[PDB]
Amino acid sequence: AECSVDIQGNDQMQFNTNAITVDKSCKQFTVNLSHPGNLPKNVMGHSWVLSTAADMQGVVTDGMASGLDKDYLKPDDSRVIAHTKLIGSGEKDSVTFDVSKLKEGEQYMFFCTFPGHSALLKGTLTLK
Ligand SMILES: [Cu+2]
């Protein structure tokens, strides 16, 4: 898949990838999130949130005080460069973003913002 990637978050607290490479040529980038499993998003919800590694913690910390109401994401978080909605099992969501929003050399992390999920459900995103 050029300029896109398919990612699954399961009931086992696992993303099927821990590293994503965004080709420097890509103009846009699309991440396809699905959620195999049986648990509903209010106990096992999963989302794909993109930020710098530097800002992950506060994004996470801010998200969990945001409630299921706001997908456990601070509304209009200027630290989030891209994000999917929060989904439960059997659900799916995609998000597309501008590669121009990524600086070379700066590090980025992707992660779920459901309470206590980002330590396990995370990975690397890098501009190549
Ligand atoms: Cu999650």
From Swiss-Prot:
Cu cation binds at H46, C112, H117, L121. Gene3D superfamilies: Cupredoxins - blue copper proteins. The keyword Nucleotide-binding does not apply. InterPro entries: Azurin, BlueCu_1, BlueCu_1_BS, Cu-binding_ET, Cupredoxin. It is found in: Periplasm. Pfam families: Copper-bind (PF00127). Residues 1-128 form the Plastocyanin-like domain. One of its GO terms (cellular component) is plasma membrane. GO terms for molecular function: copper ion binding; electron transfer activity; identical protein binding; transition metal ion binding; zinc ion binding. Its main location: periplasm. Keywords: Copper, Disulfide bond, Electron transport, Metal-binding, Periplasm, Signal, Transport. Disulfide bonds join C3-C26. Transfers electrons from cytochrome c551 to cytochrome oxidase. This is Azurin. The gene is azu.
